[PDB]
Amino acid sequence: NLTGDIVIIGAGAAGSLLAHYLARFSNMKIILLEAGHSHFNDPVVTDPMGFFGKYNPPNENISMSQNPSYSWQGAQEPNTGAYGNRPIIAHGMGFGGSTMINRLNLVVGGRTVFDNDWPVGWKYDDVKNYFRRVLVDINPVRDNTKASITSVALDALRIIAEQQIASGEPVDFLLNKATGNVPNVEKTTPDAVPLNLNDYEGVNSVVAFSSFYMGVNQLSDGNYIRKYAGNTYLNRNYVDENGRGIGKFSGLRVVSDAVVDRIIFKGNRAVGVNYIDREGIMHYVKVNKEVVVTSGAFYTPTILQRSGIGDFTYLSSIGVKNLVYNNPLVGTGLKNHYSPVTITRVHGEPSEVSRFLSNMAANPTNMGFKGLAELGFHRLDPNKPANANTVTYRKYQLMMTAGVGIPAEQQYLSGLSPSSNNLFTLIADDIRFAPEGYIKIGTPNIPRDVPKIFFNTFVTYTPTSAPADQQWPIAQKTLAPLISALLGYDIIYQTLMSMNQTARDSGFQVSLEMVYPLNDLIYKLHNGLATYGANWWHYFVPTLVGDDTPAGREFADTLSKLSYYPRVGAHLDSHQGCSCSIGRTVDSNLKVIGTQNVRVADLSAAAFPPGGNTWATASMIGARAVDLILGFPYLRDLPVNDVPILNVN
Amino acid sequence: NLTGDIVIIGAGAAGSLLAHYLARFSNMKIILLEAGHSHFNDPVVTDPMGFFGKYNPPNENISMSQNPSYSWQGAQEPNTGAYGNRPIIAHGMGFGGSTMINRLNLVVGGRTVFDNDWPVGWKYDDVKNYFRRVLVDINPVRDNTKASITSVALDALRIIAEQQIASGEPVDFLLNKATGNVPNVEKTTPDAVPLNLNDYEGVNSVVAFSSFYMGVNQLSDGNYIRKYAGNTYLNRNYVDENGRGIGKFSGLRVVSDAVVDRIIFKGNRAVGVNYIDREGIMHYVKVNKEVVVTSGAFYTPTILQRSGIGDFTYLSSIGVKNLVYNNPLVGTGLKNHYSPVTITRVHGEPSEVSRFLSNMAANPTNMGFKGLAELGFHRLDPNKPANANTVTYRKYQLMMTAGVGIPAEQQYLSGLSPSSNNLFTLIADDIRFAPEGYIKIGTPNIPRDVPKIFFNTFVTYTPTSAPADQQWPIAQKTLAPLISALLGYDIIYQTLMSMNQTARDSGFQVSLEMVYPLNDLIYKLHNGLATYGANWWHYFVPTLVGDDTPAGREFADTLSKLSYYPRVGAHLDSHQGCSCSIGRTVDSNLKVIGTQNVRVADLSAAAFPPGGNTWATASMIGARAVDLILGFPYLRDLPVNDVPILNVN
């Protein structure tokens, strides 16, 4: 039988890293069990453009996130906040987990979230060096191509930022406390210094910039390669074709195509792990010291529940026999990000519109992204944190792309064709997304693509007969996601209006029109914000308002029609996390409460979602786990010039 | 270890019956392995109204077909024919499989389909006693409640029927060859005799009626119980709490919560079966004589594939180690039915409308269905079988229900609220649904809710540069489903125009208006059909017609706008089948081609979808397997008065 000291389940963003460094810095037998296999020579994966379908077969034309050979297919339960829709969200299945199939925008998340929303021991000064490690191991690149539209948008945001600083209101979406009075917007002067949304000390919580950082490396022949958790830590320099570690890493054994079932216990001590090989034969791995679960937000909790740790009452009811620890929180508190989409039509002469939209085509160094910012709360969002006026919170990741980013059904309904060369995309991604959900295994036997995953977003508030004043604070929470999402539309609207000016100033004969959601509706929304001010959001519940004027009805009507677009004119992110978070399923040392020796070290342990894409944060937890398990800051103390050596195979 | 002579995988419609009668008529050891467990004490299942959500928790308000604890969640691949939508279609999981969670409309499927689309040895006179056995075991009931609107509608179909008969055209949708010149429409007098769509000799291929037959039985206290494959064949009179067959049935052993992995071979002879119990332990069952796979259309082929039966190149390439027989057809030829939805509004005084739409509420004896018919081909459908003028084919199953049966998003977009008391639903279900698909395991290790399932429905035809005369027959096949689907709408338009007359005649002061899809489009559609005749469907591809008249463009535009509705104004039925069919994966004895001793005896074996709901047909095949395995018509010769005795626990 296989026998290991530390057994790790899941070779994802966290597990690959965890596995790599544990082998290096210890003398233990490390066994890494992974459901998939390596895709080191699969152009669908290794060429960053493969994500966009460059190498898809024509008769089975599906993305990796839709393809069961490449991923887990997490079909969630009906979204009561979105017309009963059932989005299917993926976890990658292979070396690198989800980093194998993702869009590679690598974001730390800002200082603020870790200082306020994470516990003692997990504050930003505790994790910044681990983040630094994750980044240097990847060594991400900036966009290799300047586009005129990016500068136009920056100069437009500069003006708005100036209006905001000057007006003196305490919180608004382009204010950034640590950079004081001067707009924290990258300059568009000849010799501008690039701004790094990932600056080491976290000064740039809110910031607008010309380029994100993509997880790719350029090879000596000039191609770009996906640089991800998979080929970075588990390539042939470190692990041979039989899954055996090399040299300093000889303690590692990587088991490919190993679908783990459960953790085996003696009392509250983990002693073994079950998995099934590709022949349908079951194997037992004996555990000498610890089990570490790194199977993703959806699946880590389903493994604990199936292993007998979770809500006893529920588990017994579905036929789970061996119960280990009663903790009803396992799998609860599921969080994500969410990306409503907007579309702009550019008016003017075709040749001139063309000039304005040049250099936007996606390539590996940008993955389609041409900017722009990490933003704060809109001034009229009622749901700001208590101390939001004294530290600057991230609320939106603003992304600009070429093309037409709305869903196919919506393209038809809207008349907006992806083949129209006068259209482009803006996204205000809500990265403090209010909905919270939970995960429950439906059956006890085996891992399934589809546990119960409950995650409801843009729900309605249904009025009671109670006095208005008692309902409004209730309504405020329920409506939180619609509220933030509509304010996202206004941010983009404001921004487009200044761009109408700065575009002209930069010599472009164009005008810009927001056309999805409907131009007429957004205009009406902006005016309503000015009109009704802070309590504008009351009009989501007209019947509690008692404003039966022609003017009043029209604004209530406007918000009603608008609530449709974040529901279906949008994409749910694949940034799921926090389903087994610190303080709920595990302690501050990542050990599962109620067990002697099981830890969770992936994104599902995150106390609160990071301000931006989640890969960086996920690898960071894994990084710390190396040091937690080993009892010394080996990886924290490691010089930044020592990084894993890349092998493409 | 367990050892059996015959091992059955899946206690579904087919599997439950097969196990039951095999134990009775033989001395063999029968082992039935089922992934779920019995739900004989679960009111959600046993109460027919539980289907509609009667015992649903308000916070997890999901149907059985949506609940992973009650079913497999078959999320299919993006449908290129429906805006990239990814429907999640269920198989029931428990004693009775899908008959445990289904809507209980019990339909044989008609003589015509078995006589023509099924092979020799499987014609209707070959199977009719097996169908009878299935029905008497269940003993379905008629609607216990008469609604005026059902009869108003019937009399309306009679009128259309007289016109069709009189015109003398060979094929149109209310024509029935076996009933000559007389309308095959149920009469509406005080003492009218009921028409039986499941009539023994199959006369009523096309027929209009007041009542379907529901799989419910009435108990002595007046409640109704779901009467389904699970409790009919596997209740406590026949199988004990430990899974041991009782008395004459003592050779049967039933394993609950048994997730089967694969079949083990010695050469091409099946010798074993793998499963995982609810404790996560793998077990081996030895097979002395035969394995019968009855796991449903989605999963029966994935079991075979994991077993080494399928496309060697694909299977090898994904790590299936042990290969048995090369047949690339395994999992191909997948068919289903499909239900576009229409909505009608009733005009008039509130009080008169209320009276007209009265008595439609769903109960166990009707499961919401208030009629109406099995219809033949529309005269303008270019895709009739060659002999449609000499034998009468079923093409649509026509259903009438109260309420608003379109998806939530379409209710919002359309403005039709389900809580509005002047609306009702009509469905012309295409039961000769043209699309064909396929199933492929994504991984070799374990059963997954989500293999690759390709099923594209209402696809477009893209013109080539070749002459029109050469393209039209290609476009004709591609467009078959849109063609058949819009014509379903026209059947329904027609029925409603004639109902406006018969409603008035029955003393109701009302008028009826089709409101989903938009009244204007359907009006325009009807006129075009009259105007353009047989070649009306050429206007799905305007660029080939070269009719640049104002009129031509309006009808083309009209077909474009209408093509939206069957895509999203609809439901894919949960009637998937034919994925391992006779003549392709298995022979006429249900034996898997290339094996000594494996059979498929569930709906995946079906040669062609029955004309209506598939439960009856699924069970019929299992029934034949009984006589096929045993070598004599025991079950065929069994008197109709000898039936399983119900024990409710």
Ligand SMILES: Cc1cc2nc3c(=O)[nH]c(=O)nc-3n(C[C@H](O)[C@H](O)[C@H](O)COP(=O)(O)OP(=O)(O)OC[C@H]3O[C@@H](n4cnc5c(N)ncnc54)[C@H](O)[C@@H]3O)c2cc1C
């Ligand atoms: C479509 C998509 C787009 C994304 N976009 C980006 C982006 O642009 N930027 C960004 O920062 N992040 C992106 N991500 C998100 C980011 O990759 C994840 O949040 C991060 O990878 C989480 O890492 P993890 O280790 O915690 O989980 P994962 O990375 O997903 O690792 C899970 C691993 O566990 C394995 N596993 C699961 N169950 C078992 C089992 N029973 N037995 C054995 N192994 C098992 C899986 O095979 C998988 O390898 C995207 C992800 C997807 C799917």
Ligand SMILES: Cc1cc2nc3c(=O)[nH]c(=O)nc-3n(C[C@H](O)[C@H](O)[C@H](O)COP(=O)(O)OP(=O)(O)OC[C@H]3O[C@@H](n4cnc5c(N)ncnc54)[C@H](O)[C@@H]3O)c2cc1C
């Ligand atoms: C929501 C819904 C509505 C429908 N309503 C109707 C209706 O109104 N009228 C009608 O005539 N029909 C209805 N049906 C269709 C009908 O139920 C099915 O076509 C018919 O039951 C198919 O029977 P089957 O034997 O082929 O498969 P199933 O009845 O579905 O049974 C297959 C069994 O095999 C089990 N199984 C699968 N994989 C494994 C494994 N690896 N190991 C062990 N066991 C396994 C499954 O869990 C299941 O128990 C409906 C079905 C659904 C889901």
